[PDB]
Design a protein around this ligand. Structure first.
Ligand SMILES: Nc1ncnc2c1ncn2[C@@H]1O[C@H](COP(=O)(O)OP(=O)(O)OP(=O)(O)O)[C@@H](O)[C@H]1O
Ligand SMILES: Nc1ncnc2c1ncn2[C@@H]1O[C@H](COP(=O)(O)OP(=O)(O)OP(=O)(O)O)[C@@H](O)[C@H]1O
Ligand SMILES: [Mg+2]
Ligand SMILES: [Mg+2]
Lengths: 501, 503
């Protein structure tokens, strides 16, 4: 055999071996330099046209010669030195010059390549135009290039529900023309939502078909009936073709799906609500959290969608009302714009009210989200919890939202040393991100408003009157500052908040 | 047919028959040396790609030639002597010079990028990164190289449940680049869990497909309906292609599965809870036990996963609490880390408590194990026991865990002339069928019971059945530290009243 460079030279010099070069002329000389067999020679010497005696002379040559020499020592001898010189020069700018082009651009316009073509068969969705989160979309791409060498790995883009985890993939894959082509060769993107015990197999049924190209979606058999093991090994098969290929698993909720991408040794990205699905993986597991929208970042998001900026004082405040409500949440923001009809501080403030008094359902819209209001979405990240975690949850309604509070101070309204309350609470601000893991000054959690007006218009009416009474019970006996235990027996600073019941 | 060495040479020299070798070139010459049929020849001469006219030329060749000769007497004639020479050398370091074959005509092609390949397709799972048990992973690989010559054999990697038997295979196969390529040519890895009377056939249904390459997973017929005998002989068929091939049978529990790998004369590794499945084998049966984690080894496991080391005294003790609890058990350890939230001696000691008072379910996690808590796992190794062994088991809760005690001293709480030699008999069947106790011979025939293998029982046996074993204890109990408690002082088990209080 030869190699990519030695075969690449017979590739490069081709509109020349088309114009002038009779193969027969070389047969006698190459049956001799022992790079042919008499069946070979005649096999090529009796062809109808030359494009045959040439394509056959080339295909057959790249097999027999211990190198490319006994062919330049022929174009020289055949009055065709003008050929053997080109090929000589090509051997020189490869073995003497250790450089040619690097995987880059001499065939430009990846604008429908890396874009359109490669992305659309990855089923990547349209990236976002009118706002882009730098910080994160950047960090991601970075943590990708870092691993494009690695042989299998898990990138967890964990975050809040509806909080815009998927858009950043569509952006961080569509923005940079390196990830596709350069770092990774192809892309395959599947939304999971594996709830069933069968969704997680079936996902990797449609991946196998995401792989299987036009190469028989007709011959698509009864894939539906195959063993877990057969489909799996039958993907290892289909994988020869797609080396350095990247999977996006938009919205995973089953941990079996992750068990699967590590059984299969897959390079994958994951967008998920629940983070602990990563324990199923003993691997290069690296994560990027998707914070509630920073107080500065949101502002920018606003003007991005022609949304008016504060003139006075208690009008930016009647905007801080909204950032306070949608405690940093893209999708519940988008439901707003879409539903801020006039666009005045006026009609926005009508809504700040519809919210305190109709929860998330008071903005329920046709947002580009696959959900009406957030409530529809959250409903799920709820039913997933343990019947025990579920209980301890819907009780922590009765609270100060956007207020930082001690563990014992929570122990009062919660079911079961109150070290176990501490335990559930963390399982929560982890399994769908619902609170706050704050270590110092003192082991305290929080509860945002979005993650509240959901609860608010969702828990059985009596269950609130009950949590509040259960509050006052303990509550007795013997601003940038956490409220100490010199003054716990009264939660009266927040009587204010507590009035709204 | 040929054989493992004659077929192993066409296996070894393969990134060469990929780079340069047209099968058609050999058809005319082999229809002639009478090692083909005209249907055969055209059958291979009209293929779309060469990887076909090559895989078909190889599969078909290993059938027709009384030996491998009429193929080296061709690569010589086809200007491809650089091939026929490799294969000549390979015949030489097998029929003349034993041994020199692996160092010489095999290693200079070792490719660490080709493991990975071989491995993904053996369905070997990702080896473990952040901790590796030297002692064992090493011993294994050793006991493998020892047999890569042998024609069929059983390596039993027996051990406790969840105690990390399978990880060591993924490591001992993925760490050393000799086992794959050098010692053994290819690898096939299947998790058994054969409970049904049909799981054990079906396993060897999916192996047959593990073998059958892209060569018709489309044409996969109604394999489901074939006789035991036909599938079996139909694997002997499929085996011509995979000589020196290694099977891993992650977690076997049916002994029929072993009857099968010895009917088939298979080179296999086995990870298992129950050890007696080896009696079904009259063979080179060699075993490696997987001990509870050594008291030093565990420590290392800890720091491996950024876990804090003892500053004071009764804080390493409130670590020795945990090693004492998970009486050397990887998977029940992993459930811990995953669930040691802050990571302080504090929050770890909260858990030392959740354990004494919620058994294994007090750490039940999403560990990389295929089980929540160990309990889910053990449940099985339990329902396997004989209804009689099952009884004698759940009674030996009422005990001192991590305490070494006499047989008669057990005879008291256990079911069944007048000689308690039968208690002795069940107890051994136990620390063998899932490893549950302790086979200690001298000073005196005594067993033990670890804590993990206890807080399972603890939160599992019917409440009354404990109040009952304890009363049944005191009954006999009367009548007429590095030292076993003698029989001068048996009538009182009061040293362990301490332990016994927790009831
Ligand atoms: N420019 C933008 N960048 C990021 N997110 C945006 C942008 N514009 C709007 N969004 C909001 O995010 C919504 C969809 O977000 P996304 O699907 O990423 O959330 P998610 O966290 O993936 O939720 P899930 O995984 O549960 O579907 C949009 O319909 C919109 O409400
Ligand atoms: N080297 C290791 N590093 C970290 N964790 C380990 C290691 N070995 C074992 N474990 C623990 O054990 C789990 C898998 O254990 P393993 O599969 O080895 O046990 P097993 O004896 O095979 O049980 P079974 O026979 O039922 O498969 C891991 O998810 C982890 O919790
Ligand atoms: Mg989405
Ligand atoms: Mg296992």
């Amino acid at each position: 055999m030869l190699c990519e460079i030695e075969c690449r030279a017979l590739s490069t010099a081709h509109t020349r071996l088309i114009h002038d070069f009779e193969p027969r002329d070389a047969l006698t000389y190459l049956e001799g330099k022992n790079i042919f067999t008499e069946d070979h020679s005649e096999l090529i010497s009796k062809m109808s046209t030359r494009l045959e005696r040439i394509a056959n002379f080339l295909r057959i040559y790249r097999r027999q010669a211990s190198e490319l020499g006994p062919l330049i020592d022929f174009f020289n001898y055949n009055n065709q030195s003008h050929l053997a010189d080109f090929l000589e020069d090509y051997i020189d700018f490869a073995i003497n010059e250790p450089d040619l082009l690097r995987p880059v651009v001499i065939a430009p316009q990846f604008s429908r390549q890396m874009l359109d073509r490669k992305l659309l068969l990855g089923n990547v969705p349209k990236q976002m135009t009118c706002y882009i989160r730098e910080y994160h979309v950047d960090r991601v791409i970075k943590k990708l290039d870092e691993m494009c060498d690695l042989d299998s790995f898990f990138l967890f883009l964990h975050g809040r529900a509806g909080s815009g985890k998927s858009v950043i993939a569509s952006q961080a894959l569509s923005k940079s023309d390196q990830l596709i082509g350069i770092n990774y060769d192809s892309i395959v993107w599947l939304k999971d939502s594996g709830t069933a015990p069968k969704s997680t197999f079936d996902l990797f049924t449609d991946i196998l078909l995401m792989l299987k190209s036009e190469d028989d979606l007709l011959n698509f058999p009864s894939v539906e009936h195959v063993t877990s093991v057969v489909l799996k090994r039958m993907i290892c098969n289909a994988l020869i073709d797609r080396p350095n290929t990247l999977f996006v698993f938009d919205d995973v909720v089953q941990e079996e799906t992750i068990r699967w991408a590590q059984e299969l040794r897959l390079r994958c990205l994951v967008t998920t609500r629940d983070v602990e699905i990563s324990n199923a993986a003993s691997q290069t597991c690296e994560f990027i959290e998707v914070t509630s929208l920073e107080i500065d970042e949101c502002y920018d998001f606003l003007e991005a969608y022609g949304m008016p900026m504060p003139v006075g004082e208690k009008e930016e405040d009647v905007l801080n009302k909204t950032i306070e409500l949608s405690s940093g949440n893209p999708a519940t923001l988008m439901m707003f714009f879409k539903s801020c009809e006039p666009k005045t501080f006026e009609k926005m403030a009508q809504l700040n009210n519809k919210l305190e008094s109709r929860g998330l359902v008071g903005v329920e819209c046709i947002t580009p989200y696959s959900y009406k209001s957030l409530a529809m979405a959250l409903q799920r990240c709820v039913e997933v919890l343990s019947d025990e975690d579920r209980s301890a949850l819907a009780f922590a309604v009765v609270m100060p939202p956007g207020v930082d509070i001690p563990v014992k101070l929570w122990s009062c309204v919660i079911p079961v040393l109150d070290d176990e309350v501490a335990d559930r609470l963390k399982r929560l601000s982890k399994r769908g991100a619902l609170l706050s893991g704050k270590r110092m000054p003192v082991l305290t959690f929080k509860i945002d408003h979005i993650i509240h007006m959901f609860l608010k218009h969702v828990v059985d009416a009596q269950t609130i009157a009950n949590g509040i009474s259960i509050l006052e019970q303990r509550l007795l006996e013997i601003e940038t500052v956490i409220r100490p235990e010199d003054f716990p027996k009264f939660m009266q600073l927040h009587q204010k908040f507590y009035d709204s019941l």
